[PDB]
RNA sequence: UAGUGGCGAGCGAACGGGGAUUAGCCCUUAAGCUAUUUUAGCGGAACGCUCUGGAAAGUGCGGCCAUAGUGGGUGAUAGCCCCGUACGCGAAAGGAUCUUUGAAGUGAAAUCAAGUAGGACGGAGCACGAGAAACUUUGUCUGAACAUGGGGGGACCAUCCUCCAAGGCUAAAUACUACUGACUGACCGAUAGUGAACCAGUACCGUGAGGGAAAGGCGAAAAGAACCCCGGAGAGGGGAGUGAAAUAGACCUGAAACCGUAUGCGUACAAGCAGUGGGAGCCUACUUGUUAGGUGACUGCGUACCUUUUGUAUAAUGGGUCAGCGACUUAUAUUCAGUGGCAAGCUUAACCGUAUAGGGUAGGCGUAGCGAAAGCGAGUCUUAAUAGGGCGU
C-alpha cells in the first residue's frame, strides 16, 4: 500500500530553518550571534588566515621533488594473482582482469597472502619475500 | 508454491520469492521512481531580470524617507523574488544492486497476500475490448496489472480504453505499479524471467 | 508551490482579540497595542496567585485579634495558648467561628486561659 | 572539479599514511652563530601538531 | 596532477584511454575543372425511466459503446445531449525536400613554392609574469640548401626515429531563437504571472537621450425595472413588476482599522502604563440565585514593547492604526554523523537503448608502507650502522 510505508526512524531529519519564533531555538538571529564579521551576509574568513601573523604554509620551507617515474608504477599483492585466468601472468592479462590500470608498465610482486594456483609469472618482477612463495606454492618465475 | 489456474505448481527458487520484507528499502525506492524526472519547469525571476529599475530614486541623505537605491527590489512592490528558482532536475541514483533488492522484495509480500495470480497463457484474439472484458470474467477480476513478456499488438490495442485494465512487459513493471494495482497477472513465462533478472 | 498567508494570519489575530476585550478604547481594538496588554495581563494574573494567598492570611489574623481582644486576650498569647495544649485549628476556621458561631469561639479562649498561656 | 587546493602548502606539506611531514624551519643563511646541539636537531622531517591539522587541512582542499 | 606564480592571490595543460560522427581530394593560380511532404477539409461508435430542485450531468434503477474513458461545455457532478478524440483520402494551384535535368556555379577534379626558412633587437599567442626558454606569430633591419636537400623530437650537441613548409577545395557530428506549430507542467491565479488579462510602452514626467503607472467578475438568459407617488420640468427614494434570489439593480462573496444609531449597567470631592486579586449592587435570562451572561462603586499590589549595551520607566533608538506582500536559497565538488545495499571488494561518467529497465567498468576509492629521490618492501629511512631512533604493520 502506497498509503502505508514509510522510512527507519532516524534515516530522515528534517532541515531547522533558522529565523523564524522565538520557541524553535534558532529565532532573530539563527546561530550567528552578534555584531563582527562572522555575522554578516558572506563572513568568510578566508582559509588559512590567521589574523595577521604569518600563516603555517608561508613559514616553513618547500622541500619537495616530483619525479617523474612513479607516473608509469604500480604493484600487486601476491594474493591477487590468482584472479587472472589462464594461469600465465603477463603484462596485459593483469590489464584486461583490470587488476592494475592502464598505461602502466614496470610492475612488481610483494607479500600479502598465500598465492591460492601455479602460475607463471612473465614481464614481472616479484621481491624476495614474493618469489619465496611462488617458487614453493606451485608457481615458475620466469621472463 | 506458485499455483497455476491451470494445473501443477511451477516450484520457483526462493531466492528471489519468500525473501524478507524490508520496507525503508522499499520506502526509498518509490520515491526516487515517483520523483523520477518531473516535468520540473519553476521559473521565477530575481532583482536582475525585471523590467527597467536602475537609478537611485530620491538621493541618500536630506529627503526623510527611508534608504532605498531601486525601485525593482523585494521589499518594494512588483520588485522581484529575492530567491528565484531557475529549472532543475529531480534524480536521486539509487543503485543497480539496490534497486533489485527492492524489487526483491515486493514480490515477496506480493506473495504472503496472495495479490498474484499466476496463469499458463493469457492471450487474446482479435483487437476487441469487449472480447478483453470477457476474458478477465473467468479469472474473477476487474482492475489488474497484466505482467507478461509477448505484449501483443492484440493486446497493447485493448486496454488502452479499460477503466482500471494496464498491460506492460516485464522489464517495464516498476516499484509503484506492482504496490498499486491491488491484483497483479503474471504468466509462466514472466516468473521465468525474474530469475533472470533478479536471480 | 506558492503559499498566501492571509488566512491563518487572521485566525490568529481574532484570538488576541477574543482575549482583550472589555478593556479600555485602543486596547481592545487595535493588534498592535492589544498584544501588549494581553502578555502584561498574564504576569500579573501568575503574580496575584501568590499574593491571593498572603491577602486572604493577613485578614484571617486581623479578625481573631479583634475578637480575642473582646474576650480578654491578643492574638499573640492566644496562639501560644493553643500551642500549649493541642488543638490544631487553621486561620481560616477560627475566623469563621469568631464573626458566624460566637459562641463556640468563646468556648475556644477560656480554654487557651487555663492553658496559662 | 570545482575545489581547488592551494599550491604553497601542496609544497610544503607531503602526506603520508602517519600525518603531514615537514621540514623544520630556521636553518638558513646564519648558521655560524649556531651550536651544533641545535643544528642537527633541525634535520630531520617531522610530523604536524594537533592544534594545526585543521587548519591546514582546510587550506589543503581536504574537507 | 606536472608546471607556472610579488612561488602571493591564483591560473592551469598534455601524453594516454572511453564515446558521438565516417569522405577526402587537389590548382581562382606554372598549365584549370574552382521522388515526398506542405499550406482547407471530410467521415467519426454508444441512454432510458425515477426522485428532489428555478434548472439533472446528481439519488435511484437497468442497458450499451470502445484501436477513441480523466478532454472541452451544456441552467449543478455527462464514455452514450453538443463540439471533438483513433485511421484514411488528399489538392485546380503554389511551396519546400530527396531525386533525373538543363546550363552554370554545389565541383567530383595536375605539378609546385624566395625576399621564403632562419637570424638580430622590440612585442604578442602558447597553461608558461627572461626564466636553462623550445615552438608559432610579425613592426623595424637582414638573409639561405634544392626534396643527394630539408625541420621536428621543450637550453645545447652528436646518434636514431618521423614527416615534405613557403598554392588551393571540402559533408557529418556542433551553437542559437526575434518567428511558427503541436504538446506538457508537484508553474502564476489579478499587490502574483510579462512593465501590460482592462484600447500599455498608453496616460503622465522630461529641451532631449530616457523613465514609466493605475486599472478583471450582475444573471442560466437582459428577462437592464411598463405603471403610480414626493422632487427643480432633476438627483435620490417609496411602491409595483422580472427573476431561484434585488441586503443579485448596473452590481459574486463582502473582512479589519474608521464612523454612527438604539438598548442595558457605571461615572460631576477625585490624582498616574488604565490591568490584576478580593468585591457590594443592579440588569436579562434559565426552574429561577452559585443554575449563566453583561456592567464594576470600593480596595491591596502594579514606572508599556523592541534594539543596543557594564546599566534604560528612561529626557537614548524606532513605530499614526489597519489590510496585503517583505529576509538562511540553489548548483557543482568534499568532510563528519544517522539509517540502508552488496562486501577484499564496492561503483560506473558520457553515450547507446522498444528510453525511469538494460548495456556501458574507461576512470575512482580501497586491500602496505618508508624515503626528497632512485629504490627496497612487512618493513624502510638516517648513518661508517648491522647500534640507537622516526614512521609502519
Redesign the pocket.
Given at each position: 500500500q502506497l498509503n502505508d510505508l514509510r522510512?527507519?526512524?532516524?534515516?530522515?531529519?528534517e532541515?531547522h530553518?533558522?529565523?523564524?519564533g522565538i520557541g524553535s531555538g534558532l529565532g532573530?538571529?539563527?546561530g550567528?550571534g552578534?555584531?563582527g564579521l562572522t555575522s554578516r551576509s558572506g563572513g568568510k574568513v578566508?582559509?588559512?588566515f590567521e589574523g595577521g601573523q604569518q600563516?603555517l604554509?608561508?613559514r616553513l620551507p618547500?622541500?619537495?621533488?616530483?619525479?617523474?617515474?612513479?607516473?608509469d608504477?604500480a604493484?600487486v599483492?601476491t594474493?591477487?594473482l590468482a584472479?587472472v585466468e589462464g594461469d600465465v601472468v603477463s603484462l596485459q592479462t593483469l590489464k584486461?582482469a583490470?587488476?592494475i590500470?592502464?598505461?602502466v608498465q614496470?610492475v612488481?610482486v610483494?607479500?600479502?597472502g598465500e598465492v591460492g594456483r601455479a602460475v607463471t609469472l612473465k614481464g614481472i618482477?616479484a621481491?624476495?619475500?614474493?618469489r619465496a612463495a611462488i617458487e614453493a606454492a606451485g608457481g615458475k618465475f620466469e621472463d | 508454491q506458485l499455483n497455476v489456474n491451470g494445473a501443477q505448481a511451477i516450484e520457483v527458487s526462493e531466492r528471489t520469492f519468500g525473501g524478507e520484507f524490508?520496507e525503508?528499502?522499499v520506502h526509498?525506492a518509490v520515491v526516487?521512481?515517483?520523483?523520477?524526472?518531473?516535468?520540473?519547469?519553476?521559473?521565477?525571476?530575481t532583482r536582475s531580470?525585471?523590467?527597467?529599475?536602475?537609478?537611485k530614486p530620491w538621493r541618500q541623505k536630506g529627503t526623510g524617507r527611508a534608504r532605498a537605491g531601486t525601485?525593482?527590489s523585494?521589499?518594494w512592490?512588483?520588485?522581484?523574488?529575492?530567491?528565484?528558482?531557475?529549472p532543475?532536475?529531480?534524480?536521486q541514483?539509487?543503485?543497480?544492486?539496490?534497486?533489485?533488492?527492492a524489487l526483491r522484495s515486493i514480490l515477496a509480500e506480493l506473495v504472503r497476500l496472495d495479490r498474484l495470480v499466476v496463469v499458463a497463457d493469457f492471450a487474446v484474439d482479435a483487437?476487441?475490448?469487449?472480447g478483453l472484458?470477457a476474458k478477465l470474467d473467468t479469472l474473477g477480476l476487474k482492475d489488474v496489472l497484466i505482467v507478461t513478456d509477448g505484449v501483443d499488438e492484440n493486446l497493447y490495442?485493448?486496454?488502452?480504453?479499460?477503466?482500471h485494465v494496464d498491460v506492460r512487459?516485464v522489464?517495464?513493471?516498476?516499484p509503484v505499479s506492482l504496490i498499486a494495482y491491488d491484483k497483479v497477472l503474471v504468466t509462466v513465462s514472466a516468473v521465468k524471467k525474474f530469475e533472470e533478472?533478479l536471480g | 508551490?506558492?503559499?498566501?498567508?492571509?488566512?491563518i494570519?487572521?485566525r490568529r489575530?481574532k484570538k488576541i482579540l477574543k482575549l482583550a476585550?472589555?478593556?479600555?478604547?485602543?486596547?481592545?481594538?487595535?493588534?498592535?497595542?492589544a498584544?501588549?496588554?494581553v502578555?502584561?495581563?498574564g504576569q500579573?494574573?501568575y503574580?496575584?496567585?501568590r499574593?491571593?494567598k498572603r491577602?486572604?492570611r493577613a485578614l484571617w489574623i486581623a479578625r481573631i485579634n479583634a475578637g480575642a481582644r473582646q474576650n480578654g486576650l491578643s492574638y499573640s498569647r492566644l496562639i501560644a495558648g493553643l500551642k500549649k495544649a493541642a488543638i490544631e485549628i487553621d486561620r481560616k476556621v477560627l475566623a469563621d467561628l469568631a464573626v458566624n458561631e460566637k459562641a463556640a469561639f468563646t468556648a475556644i479562649v477560656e480554654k487557651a486561659k487555663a492553658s496559662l498561656a | 572539479?570545482?575545489?581547488?587546493?592551494?599550491?604553497?602548502a601542496?609544497?610544503?606539506f607531503?602526506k603520508?599514511?602517519?600525518?603531514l611531514?615537514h621540514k623544520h624551519a630556521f636553518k638558513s643563511h646564519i648558521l655560524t652563530k649556531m651550536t651544533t646541539k641545535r643544528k642537527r636537531q633541525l634535520?630531520?622531517?617531522?610530523?604536524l601538531n594537533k592544534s594545526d591539522v585543521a587548519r591546514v587541512e582546510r587550506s589543503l582542499?581536504?574537507?
Open positions: 522510512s527507519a526512524p532516524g534515516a530522515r531529519r532541515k530553518r533558522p529565523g523564524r532573530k538571529t539563527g550567528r552578534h555584531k578566508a582559509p588559512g600563516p604554509h608561508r618547500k622541500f619537495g621533488f616530483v619525479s617523474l617515474k612513479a607516473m608504477r604493484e599483492r594474493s591477487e584472479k584486461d583490470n587488476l590500470n592502464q598505461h614496470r612488481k610483494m607479500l600479502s618482477a621481491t624476495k619475500g614474493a | 524490508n525503508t528499502l526509498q526516487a521512481y515517483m520523483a523520477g524526472g518531473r516535468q520540473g519547469s519553476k521559473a521565477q525571476k531580470e525585471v523590467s527597467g529599475g536602475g537609478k525601485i525593482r523585494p521589499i512592490r512588483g520588485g522581484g523574488t529575492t530567491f528565484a528558482a531557475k532543475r532536475s529531480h534524480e541514483k539509487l543503485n543497480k544492486k539496490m534497486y533489485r533488492a483487437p476487441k475490448t469487449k472484458v490495442l485493448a486496454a488502452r480504453n479499460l477503466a512487459d522489464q517495464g513493471s516498476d533478472l | 508551490a506558492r503559499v498566501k498567508r492571509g488566512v494570519a487572521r489575530h476585550k472589555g478593556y479600555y478604547g485602543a486596547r481592545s481594538r487595535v493588534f498592535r497595542v498584544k501588549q496588554a502578555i502584561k495581563a500579573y494574573a503574580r496575584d496567585r499574593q491571593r491577602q486572604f | 572539479p570545482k575545489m581547488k587546493t592551494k599550491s604553497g601542496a609544497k610544503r607531503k603520508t599514511a602517519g600525518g611531514k634535520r630531520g622531517t617531522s610530523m582542499r581536504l574537507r
